[model samples]
Target: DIPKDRFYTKTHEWALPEGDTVLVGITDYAQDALGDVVYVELPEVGRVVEKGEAVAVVESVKTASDIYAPVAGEIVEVNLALEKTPELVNQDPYGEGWIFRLKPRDMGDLDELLDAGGYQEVLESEA
Candidate 1:
């Protein structure tokens, strides 16, 4: 239930190091579990976040969950469209619904994230 194109952190966020920035987003597995997204709050840009730190929030009919940064980076841009149509997250969890893009403090940090196959086994292991 994950895309092979990006790296995934165990907490269920996906990271795609694309075009000089890392594109961060919620996972398909996560959105389905969250039900309908009522709203979202992404971290403000121009702030650096440590790996494992909460960088954004998502609220669903089910509840809320903190979206953590999978690696160290400074938030450069956010999905402003989310606040207007938070439901976009449940439908396009991997695409336009992405949370933000950030410049990694260390590019190699991405290499430390879980790849699709690794993440797949990880999800199953905990379930």
Candidate 2:
């Protein structure tokens, strides 16, 4: 299900602003495409990242996929719980399944990303 509380990227990553940091996660559609989760590469905390940069990896039973940063920022935190239970990515992508928390260089950059409606349009455009 699509949520309007945050911004979505055409790549299907979601950025949810929480306090001074923004939470990052792949969309439900992404996990669905990737199939059964096997493992995830949690990013190193304090690593400075750029928007559109691939910061982590998600591995599925079918294949592995990259998770990109939606906004330029330093990785402040990651989902440690993910290492043991990658299934969380499919079970709750927008919630406890989140990948990393980024301290965005500029919160304003979030405005450039897509909203729920806009993301739905992107999903629709896919054949």
Candidate 3:
């Protein structure tokens, strides 16, 4: 089940608001679909990113997928722990597995993202 406090994207990424910044990561469904994560390429801290643009890359035994930015902003931090234990994405996607944090260019963008109920509908429709 998706957390009610977080927002979601069509691409299966979740965004959790943290003060003025937002923490981003793939959903549990995404991790399951990708199989076991083996590597992650994170964006540089302080780099500006546009909404819907690729911010990171997650590699698995099956294939590689880009992690898109849910909203435009500058990357403030990344989960460096993934470098040594990429599997954390599969183990705990909503916690230590978070990809990165961004200082949103427009806080209003947060409301534009899907809520838990909306995201559940997305999952059902995809099925």
Task: Give the number of the best model, judged by lDDT.
Answer: 3
How much is the lDDT of residue 95 in candidate 3? Answer: 88
Over 20-75, each residue of candidate 2 has an lDDT whose tens digit, in order, gives 88999999999999998989998899999998889999999888888899989899
| Candidate 3 residue-wise lDDT, 34-87, digit = tens | 999999999999999999999899999999999999999999999999999999
TM-score for all models, in order of appearance: 0.96, 0.97, 0.98
Error of 1 at 68 (Å): 0.7
Candidate ranking under lDDT, highest first, comes to 3, 2, 1
Give candidate 3 regions above 4 Å deviation: none
Let me know the TM-score candidate 3 reaches against the reference structure.
0.98
Off by over 4 Å in 1: none
- Per-residue lDDT of model 1, residues 39-118, tens digit only: 99889999999999987899999999999988888999999999899998899998988988988999888998899998
| Number of the candidate with higher TM-score, 1 or 3 | 3
